[PDB]
Coordinates of N, CA and C in Angstrom, one line a residue:
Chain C
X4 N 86.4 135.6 103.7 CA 87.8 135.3 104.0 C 88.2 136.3 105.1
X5 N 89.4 136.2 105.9 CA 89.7 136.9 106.5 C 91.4 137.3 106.8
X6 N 92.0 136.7 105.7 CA 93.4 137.3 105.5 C 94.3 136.1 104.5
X7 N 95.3 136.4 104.1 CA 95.7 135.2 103.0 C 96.7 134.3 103.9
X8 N 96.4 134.0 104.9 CA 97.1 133.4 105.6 C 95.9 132.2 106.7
X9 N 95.9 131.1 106.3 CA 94.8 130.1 106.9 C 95.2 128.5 106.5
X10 N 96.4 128.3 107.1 CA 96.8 127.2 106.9 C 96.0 126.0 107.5
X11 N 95.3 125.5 107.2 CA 94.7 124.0 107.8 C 95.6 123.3 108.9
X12 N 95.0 123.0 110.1 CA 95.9 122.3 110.8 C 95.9 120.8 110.7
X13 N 96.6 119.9 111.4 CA 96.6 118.1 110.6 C 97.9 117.9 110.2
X14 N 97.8 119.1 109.1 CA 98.9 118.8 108.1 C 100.5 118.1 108.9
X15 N 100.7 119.0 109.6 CA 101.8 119.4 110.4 C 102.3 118.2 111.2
X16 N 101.0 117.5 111.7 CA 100.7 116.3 112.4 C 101.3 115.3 111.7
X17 N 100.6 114.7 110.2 CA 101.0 113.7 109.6 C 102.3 113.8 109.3
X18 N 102.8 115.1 109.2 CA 104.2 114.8 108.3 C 105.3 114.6 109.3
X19 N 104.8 114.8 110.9 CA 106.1 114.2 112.0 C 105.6 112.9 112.1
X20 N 104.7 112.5 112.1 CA 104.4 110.8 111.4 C 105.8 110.8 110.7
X21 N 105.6 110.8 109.8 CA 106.4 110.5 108.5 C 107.9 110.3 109.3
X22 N 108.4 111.5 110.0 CA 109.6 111.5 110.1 C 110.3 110.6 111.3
X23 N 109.2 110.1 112.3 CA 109.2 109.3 113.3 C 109.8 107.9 112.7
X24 N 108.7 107.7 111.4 CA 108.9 106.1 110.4 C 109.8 105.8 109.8
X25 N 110.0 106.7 108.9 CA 111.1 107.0 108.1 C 112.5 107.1 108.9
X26 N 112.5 107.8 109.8 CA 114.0 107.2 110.9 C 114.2 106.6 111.5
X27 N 113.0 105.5 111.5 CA 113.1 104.3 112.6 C 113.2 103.5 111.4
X28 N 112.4 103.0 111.0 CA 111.6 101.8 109.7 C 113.0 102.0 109.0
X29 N 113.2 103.1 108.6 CA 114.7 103.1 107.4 C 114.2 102.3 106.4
X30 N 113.2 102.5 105.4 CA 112.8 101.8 104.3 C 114.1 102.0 103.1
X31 N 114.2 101.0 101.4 CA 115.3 101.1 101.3 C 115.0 102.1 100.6
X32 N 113.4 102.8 100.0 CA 112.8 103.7 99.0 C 112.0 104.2 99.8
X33 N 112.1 105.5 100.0 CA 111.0 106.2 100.2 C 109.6 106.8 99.4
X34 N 110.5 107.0 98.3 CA 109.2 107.2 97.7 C 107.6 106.0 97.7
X35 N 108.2 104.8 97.2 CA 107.1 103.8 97.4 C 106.6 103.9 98.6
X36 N 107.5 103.9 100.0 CA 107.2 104.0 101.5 C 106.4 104.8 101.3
X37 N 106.2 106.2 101.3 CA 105.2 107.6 101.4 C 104.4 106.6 100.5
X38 N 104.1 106.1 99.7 CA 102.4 105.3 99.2 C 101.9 104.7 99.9
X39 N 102.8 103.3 100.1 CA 102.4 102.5 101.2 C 101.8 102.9 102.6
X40 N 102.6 103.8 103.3 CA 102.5 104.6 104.7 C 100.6 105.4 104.6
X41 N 100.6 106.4 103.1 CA 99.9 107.1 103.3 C 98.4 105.9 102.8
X42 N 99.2 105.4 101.6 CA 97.8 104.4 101.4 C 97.1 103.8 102.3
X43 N 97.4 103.1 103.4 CA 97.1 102.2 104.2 C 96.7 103.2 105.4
X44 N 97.0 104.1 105.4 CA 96.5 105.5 106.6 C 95.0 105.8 106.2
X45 N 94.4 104.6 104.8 CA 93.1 105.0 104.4 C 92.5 103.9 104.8
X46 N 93.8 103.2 105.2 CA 92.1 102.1 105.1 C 92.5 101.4 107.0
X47 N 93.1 102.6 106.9 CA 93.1 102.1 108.9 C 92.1 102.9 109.7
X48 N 91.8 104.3 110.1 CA 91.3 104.9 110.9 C 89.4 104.0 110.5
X49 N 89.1 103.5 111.0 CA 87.9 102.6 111.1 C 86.8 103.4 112.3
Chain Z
X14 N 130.2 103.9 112.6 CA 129.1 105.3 113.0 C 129.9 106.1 113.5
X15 N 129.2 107.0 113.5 CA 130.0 108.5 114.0 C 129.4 109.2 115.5
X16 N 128.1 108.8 115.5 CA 127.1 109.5 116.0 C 125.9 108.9 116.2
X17 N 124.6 109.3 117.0 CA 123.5 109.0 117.2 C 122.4 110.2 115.9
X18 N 123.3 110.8 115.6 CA 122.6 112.4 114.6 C 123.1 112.3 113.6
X19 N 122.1 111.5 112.6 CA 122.9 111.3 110.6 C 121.9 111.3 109.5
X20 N 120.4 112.2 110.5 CA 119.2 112.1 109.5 C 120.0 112.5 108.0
X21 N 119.5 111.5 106.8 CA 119.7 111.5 105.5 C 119.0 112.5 104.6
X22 N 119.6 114.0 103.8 CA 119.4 114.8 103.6 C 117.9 114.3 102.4
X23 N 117.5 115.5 101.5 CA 116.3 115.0 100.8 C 114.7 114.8 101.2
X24 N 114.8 114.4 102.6 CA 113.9 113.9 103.2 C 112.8 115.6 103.5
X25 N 113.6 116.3 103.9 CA 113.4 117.9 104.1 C 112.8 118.5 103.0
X26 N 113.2 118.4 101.6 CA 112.9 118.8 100.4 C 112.0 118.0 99.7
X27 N 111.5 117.0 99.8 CA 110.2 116.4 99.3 C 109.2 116.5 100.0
X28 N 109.5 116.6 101.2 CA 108.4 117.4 102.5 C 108.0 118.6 101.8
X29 N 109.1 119.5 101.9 CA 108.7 121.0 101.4 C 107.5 121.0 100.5
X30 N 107.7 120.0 99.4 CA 107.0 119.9 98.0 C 105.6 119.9 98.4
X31 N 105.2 118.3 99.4 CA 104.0 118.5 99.9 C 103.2 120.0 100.4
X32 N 104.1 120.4 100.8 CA 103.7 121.7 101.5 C 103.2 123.0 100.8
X33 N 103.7 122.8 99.3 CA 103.6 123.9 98.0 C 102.4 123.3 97.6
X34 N 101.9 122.1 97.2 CA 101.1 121.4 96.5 C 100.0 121.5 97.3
X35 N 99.9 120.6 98.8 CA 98.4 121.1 99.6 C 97.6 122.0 99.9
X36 N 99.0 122.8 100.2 CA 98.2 124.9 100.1 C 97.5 125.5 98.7
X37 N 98.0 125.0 97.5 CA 98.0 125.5 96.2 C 96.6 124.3 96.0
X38 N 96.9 123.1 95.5 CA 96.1 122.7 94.8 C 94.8 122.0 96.2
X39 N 94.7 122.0 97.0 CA 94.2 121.8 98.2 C 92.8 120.9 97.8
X40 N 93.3 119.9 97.9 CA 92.7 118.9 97.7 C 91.5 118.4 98.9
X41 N 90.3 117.6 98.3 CA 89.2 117.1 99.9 C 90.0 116.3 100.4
X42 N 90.8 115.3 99.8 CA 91.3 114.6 101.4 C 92.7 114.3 100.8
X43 N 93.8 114.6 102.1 CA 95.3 114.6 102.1 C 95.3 113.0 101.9
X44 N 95.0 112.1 103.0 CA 95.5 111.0 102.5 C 95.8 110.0 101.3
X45 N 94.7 110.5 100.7 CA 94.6 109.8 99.0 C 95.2 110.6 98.4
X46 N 95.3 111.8 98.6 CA 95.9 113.1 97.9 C 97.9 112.7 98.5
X47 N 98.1 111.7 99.2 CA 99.4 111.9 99.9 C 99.9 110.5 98.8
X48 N 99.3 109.7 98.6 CA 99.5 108.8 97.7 C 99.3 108.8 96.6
X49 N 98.5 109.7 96.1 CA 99.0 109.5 94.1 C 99.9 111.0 94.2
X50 N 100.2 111.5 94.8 CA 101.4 112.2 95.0 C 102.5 111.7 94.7
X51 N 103.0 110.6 95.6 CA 104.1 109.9 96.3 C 104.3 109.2 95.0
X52 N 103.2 108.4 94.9 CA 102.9 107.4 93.7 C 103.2 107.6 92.5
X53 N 102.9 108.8 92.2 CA 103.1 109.0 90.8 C 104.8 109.7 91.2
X54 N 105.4 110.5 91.6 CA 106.5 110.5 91.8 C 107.9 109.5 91.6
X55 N 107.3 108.2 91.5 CA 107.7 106.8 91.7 C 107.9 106.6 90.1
X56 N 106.8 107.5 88.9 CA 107.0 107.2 87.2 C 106.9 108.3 86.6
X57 N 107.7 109.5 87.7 CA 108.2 111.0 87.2 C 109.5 110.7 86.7
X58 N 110.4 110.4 88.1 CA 111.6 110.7 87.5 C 112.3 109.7 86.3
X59 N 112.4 110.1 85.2 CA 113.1 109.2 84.0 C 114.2 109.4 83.6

């Protein structure tokens, strides 16, 4: 290791996804949305 | 309307959550990990 500080990058990425969708799309639930959104983010990159 | 600027509060604070959970419990892969997250959140709150 080399310090307690090593955040993964990505992360950062997906979650301005999120907020791009979620302020456009305006689903009426988010919570189910965040399933849907992330679920289907598995079975897309091909 | 008031405005073009009325992001809906909440959205910032379930974000956060992700953010405590993938550093901590750091899962092999975010996507599947983004949905039984979400998912089960969906038959938390009672």
């Amino acid at each position: 290791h080399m310090g307690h500080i090593q955040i993964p990058p990505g992360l950062t990425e997906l979650l301005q996804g999120y907020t791009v969708e979620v302020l456009r799309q305006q689903p009426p639930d988010l919570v189910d949305f965040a399933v849907e959104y992330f679920t289907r983010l598995r079975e897309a990159r091909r």
